[PDB]
Design a protein around this ligand. Sequence first.
Ligand SMILES: CC(C)Oc1ccc(-c2ccnc(NC(P(=O)(O)O)P(=O)(O)O)c2)cc1
Ligand SMILES: CC(C)Oc1ccc(-c2ccnc(NC(P(=O)(O)O)P(=O)(O)O)c2)cc1
Ligand SMILES: [Mg+2]
Ligand SMILES: [Mg+2]
Ligand SMILES: [Mg+2]
Ligand SMILES: [Mg+2]
Ligand SMILES: [Mg+2]
Ligand SMILES: [Mg+2]
Lengths: 346, 346
Amino acid sequence: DVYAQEKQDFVQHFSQIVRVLTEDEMGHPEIGDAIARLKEVLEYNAIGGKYNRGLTVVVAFRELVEPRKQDADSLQRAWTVGWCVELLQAFFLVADDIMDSSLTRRGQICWYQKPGVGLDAINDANLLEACIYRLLKLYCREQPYYLNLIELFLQSSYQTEIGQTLDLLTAPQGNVDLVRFTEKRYKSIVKYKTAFYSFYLPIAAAMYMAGIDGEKEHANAKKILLEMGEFFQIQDDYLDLFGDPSVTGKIGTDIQDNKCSWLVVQCLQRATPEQYQILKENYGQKEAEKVARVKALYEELDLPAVFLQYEEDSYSHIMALIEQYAAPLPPAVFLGLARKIYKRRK
Amino acid sequence: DVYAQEKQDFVQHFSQIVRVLTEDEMGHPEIGDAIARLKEVLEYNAIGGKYNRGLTVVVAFRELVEPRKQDADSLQRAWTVGWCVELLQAFFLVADDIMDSSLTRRGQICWYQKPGVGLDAINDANLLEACIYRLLKLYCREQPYYLNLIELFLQSSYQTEIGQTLDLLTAPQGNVDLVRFTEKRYKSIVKYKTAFYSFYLPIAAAMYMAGIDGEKEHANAKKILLEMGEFFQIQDDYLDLFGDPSVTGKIGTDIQDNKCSWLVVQCLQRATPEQYQILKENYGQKEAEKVARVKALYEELDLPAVFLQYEEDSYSHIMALIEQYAAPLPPAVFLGLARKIYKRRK
Ligand SMILES: CC(C)Oc1ccc(-c2ccnc(NC(P(=O)(O)O)P(=O)(O)O)c2)cc1
Ligand SMILES: CC(C)Oc1ccc(-c2ccnc(NC(P(=O)(O)O)P(=O)(O)O)c2)cc1
Ligand SMILES: [Mg+2]
Ligand SMILES: [Mg+2]
Ligand SMILES: [Mg+2]
Ligand SMILES: [Mg+2]
Ligand SMILES: [Mg+2]
Ligand SMILES: [Mg+2]
């Protein structure tokens, strides 16, 4: 609703972000070709997703700062920092698509699959990460929350990389890992790989920008936001397989990649010993017929209906956590975000 | 000399660095497997090089801080920050070896070529980068130079990535780029990809730790150190091809990878029109016979002797820059480093 509202406004600011990041081109002409590559990287990889994280920073900021303190420069810093969380996302996805052997992202061929790009996209991804701290320095360097924001982005990156490491370790190519795909492990993976940077980070950044820096306040927000991020990753796994690629913009790879998906964890909890064999013989391999076999098993087990029920119960639980932990922050802060992702198809 | 001295001391501290980075394992057992992977990454990828950058931080620190201000904690911070520049190096090399299709590094198979690793090494490389800011926070957070060090590492990373981008852009696979391999372009590539992080960064970090933060002082040091780093990269290119892989620990790939190497730039300046054709038909391709053809051309052109002369003249020039710009810093600071790299065979 409020997200829907701010969406055109937020995307319109992207041209300024690009302009400012590429403005070193007059002062140091010797790096002109690299800066033209950076602009190409930014245009391809920072546009076309939902902008949920960047929008959350902007919306939260507006709801947390007294309107009389929202002058032009303040607002600009807020949307700049929203764009930083978007650049973080861009960095992670570019690299992740290489590591997951993915084909499409946000409705187009993955950056690394473009002819002429390939593993150069590794450097590209890191340049996106570098842009975050260039923007923080250009816009927020004089603010009392500058160090807090730097440390929050760096810590958020580390936690996300640790998540990514548990993701890759639980999914060896070439090895059947069924014994490792447990509820407990799944929760640990998604807490680190998705929830810190996609839920806690944007709200925490707007909190620090609003001068809300207390540990108790951050720990309360974190309780809501981490559970929100677990739920969002369960949706992401559901969408990898049962989503429409023309709506989600991406082709699924979790089964081929041997991933500890929410779907395989649920499959294992309900599997007969015979169906367990079907999973063991078919999971984590590149053959289309083996992937289809696993999908048919999930459908045979009513997993889409089980996903609908989990989502209702978990949404109710997040709503209870908001009732417990939102204060003294406006509940709308957390609700706008829950409503943006409840029942999402992309 | 002084580097030779501090080398066993510096390497001995690596076990503490590992211990402290892996100490989150008692508090959050859920990330234990990721932290065991991080230790494996650190042990494989942070050990076995020359430790020139880490040692430079330690040596410079000792020479810049009054001995009476060098207490146990101070020294520990200094070697910790030396280890940060080593982790930066580890991050860059792991990723670079993927992008360059390299085989060996520091005397062993490149991390990404280890069976079971492959493109997971992308996440590994970034975890190494994350460790830098974890160590800065654990050891330097209360110091007046904390922000300065954070911003120096982040800026140094960005400049190095911009260098890497000019390197990749000047070396397209599958395309003959001979027209782009100019003196001017070469100097711009190596200034950004090597000189800022390998020469300016360690000395600048020890300067900031010694409370030397003035812009004029940093700009003078930079003049010496950037020229030093250009010269060091010219040596690196010379070693890619004419070095002993059992001494350098790495197999060369510049000719196969179509790189704007110092050697190809020199080859082009002296080539007859016929030899230019030999280069055009043979450079930037994977065939062993084509690589050998290019090497024979370089040897036919006395390029090893031309490298010896350039090195003498450039070393003399760096020495002149030290005479002009060292003050008020001890010249030994820059000389120890020049002497560590003059005439190096690895
Ligand atoms: C350094 C870089 C390799 O680190 C990361 C890169 C990407 C990610 C990450 C986190 C959460 N989601 C994704 N992508 C999703 P997605 O491909 O969009 O479905 P996942 O592959 O987890 O299902 C990537 C985490 C860390
Ligand atoms: C994000 C990551 C991809 O960025 C970088 C990674 C590595 C480098 C870099 C800088 C200087 N030297 C190297 N390696 C050398 P080397 O392989 O050791 O001979 P080069 O391939 O330039 O000849 C790598 C620069 C940036
Ligand atoms: Mg993934
Ligand atoms: Mg993925
Ligand atoms: Mg997914
Ligand atoms: Mg390279
Ligand atoms: Mg290389
Ligand atoms: Mg080299």
